[PDB]
Amino acid sequence: LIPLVNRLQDAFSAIGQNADLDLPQIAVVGGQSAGASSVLENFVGRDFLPRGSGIVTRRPLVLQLVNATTEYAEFLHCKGKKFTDFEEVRLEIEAETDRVTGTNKGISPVPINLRVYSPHVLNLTLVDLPGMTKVPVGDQPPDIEFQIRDMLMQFVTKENCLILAVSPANSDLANSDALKVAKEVDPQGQRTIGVITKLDLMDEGTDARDVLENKLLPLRRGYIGVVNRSQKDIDGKKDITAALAAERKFFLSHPSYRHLADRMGTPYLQKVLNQQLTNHIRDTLPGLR
Amino acid sequence: YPRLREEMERIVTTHIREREGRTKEQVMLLIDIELAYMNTNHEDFIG
Ligand SMILES: Nc1nc2c(ncn2[C@@H]2O[C@H](COP(=O)(O)OP(=O)(O)O)[C@@H](O)[C@H]2O)c(=O)[nH]1
Ligand SMILES: [Mg+2]
């Protein structure tokens, strides 16, 4: 079923003018290879982002959804071309990245603007940022760490902006740069939500049960655990439906997560973000009405 | 108490919003009343 706040965007689309909801911007932040771009991919529901091991995200991708009757994408460059095949979108993203950054692992602050039209996508804006690193590699100047942080500090330091802190499960939580940034810009935990991405790669004999129960490093809004497609599966062209079925099997099966099964997965993350967004319009509805 | 501060501020601001919708009607209606009739009986050259 369609949640009410989506039904509103459908209605305002039917009206066609002079009305729209005011929603926050969503930013995803994490360390390199954490799995952030597989989180945006899962959330949107279309496999159009470049993904894989190593530096991939070299530029800020400002994905802007729009509600419409037909599914397609477009860029603010290559004006007028309507992309109905998202593989072309993915290749265009890679080509646009290379045209500016170069091929020797360069990083640039100039954002890439993409707009996606689809039936039930409210007007949510999503931002993808290029990870975080400590040691320069390739044709990267020594001070790349500060430039990447400075890129982050232009999005997560604004209000009206949710933050997803993405952190791998097979790396002790104390090392996460996502939480460090979220804690620095959102000390009270008001906007931050935590995502734990690689629960299937835990070294045999360990788990993240202590982190999923919000005990080890208490965060106001809790932690949500997800399992995405491995490198082989993405190279094997596995469909999202199979990935979701696998995620459900994993959480339902793992002995340490059976009692948390109903709070874990991508769909639950969707519910949490729908409730979060629904609660940012409550005091504005009287004006719309 | 983050939950209680959040709710309390949401409620008091939603109320202030529902009242802006009533405060602005009487300002429009007072200007309309100013346009309905021309009263030259006081504090004017003729009066
Ligand atoms: N097995 C497994 N691999 C994952 C999971 N999440 C992410 N990965 C791997 O992480 C790799 C890189 O993730 P990526 O999306 O690039 O994170 P980014 O570097 O922030 O873009 C992908 O190739 C995935 O195969 C997971 O839940 N399980
Ligand atoms: Mg990335």
DSSP secondary structure of A111-130: PEEEEEEETT-TT-EEEE--
Return the sign of the alpha-carbon dihedral for residues A77, A114, A183, A190: positive
> How close does chain B come to A166, measured CA to CA in Å?
23
Q: What distance, in Å, lies between the first and last C-alpha atoms of chain A?
A: 24
In order of A25, A126, A266, the CA distances from A161 in angstroms are 5, 10, 20
CB count, 10 Å around CB of A86? Answer: 17
Q: At A128, which amino acid appears? A: D
CB interface of A with B, residues 260-289, below 8 Å: 282-284, 286-287
Asked if A203 has any chain B CB less than 8 Å from its own CB, the reply is no
Instruction: Copy the structure tokens of residue A188.
Output: 């009270």
Atom 21, ligand 1: residue with shortest CA distance: A37
DSSP for A63-107, written as a single string: EEEEE-SS-EEEESSSTT--B--HHHHHHHHHHHHHHHH-SSS--
In order of A50, A169, A195, A246, the CA distances from A234 in angstroms are 11, 20, 20, 14
Instruction: Copy the structure tokens of residue A195.
Output: 């995502």
CB contact under 8 A, A283 and B21: no
Instruction: Copy the structure tokens of residue A83.
Output: 């992309």
Return the sign of the alpha-carbon dihedral for residues A69, A72, A77, A81: negative
Angle at B37 between CA B31 and CA B40, to 5 degrees: 115
DSSP for chain B, written as a single string: -HHHHHHHHHHHHHHHHHHHHHHTHHHHHHHHHHHH----SSSSS--
Closest CB from B2, B10, B14 relative to A286: B14
Structure resolution, Å: 3.3
Experimental method: cryo-EM
Instruction: Copy the structure tokens of residue A217.
Output: 């490093």
Residues in chain A: 289
**Cα-to-chain-centroid distance, residue B18:** 11
Angle at A60 between CA A192 and CA A176, to 5 degrees: 40
Beta carbons of A22 and A13 less than 8 angstroms apart: no
Q: What distance, in Å, lies between the first and last C-alpha atoms of chain B?
A: 64
DSSP for A17-49, written as a single string: SS------EEEEEE-TTSSHHHHHHHHHT---S
| Beta strands across the sheet bearing A192-196 | A72-75, A112-118, A61-67, A125-128, A25-30, A161-167, A192-196, A223-225
Which of A29, A51, A105, A195 most suits a substitution to test ligand 1, by most atoms within 8 Å of the C-beta? A51
- Residue A167 DSSP label: E
Nearest Cα neighbor of A160 from A25, A281, A273 is: A25
Ligand at shortest distance from the CA of A197: 1
| Phi and psi, residue A255, nearest 5° | -55, -35
In order of A127, A132, A156, A178, the CA distances from A144 in angstroms are 20, 9, 19, 17
CB contact under 8 A, B2 and A188: yes
Torsion on CA atoms A278, A30, A40, A59, rounded to nearest 10: 120
- Calpha distance A46→A36 (Å, rounded): 15
Helix, strand, coil percent values for chain A (each to nearest 5): 40, 15, 45
- Calpha distance A42→A269 (Å, rounded): 10
Q: Which residues contact A105 (CB under 8 A, 6 or more apart)?
A: A55, A58, A137, A138, A139, A140
Q: At A204, which amino acid appears? A: E
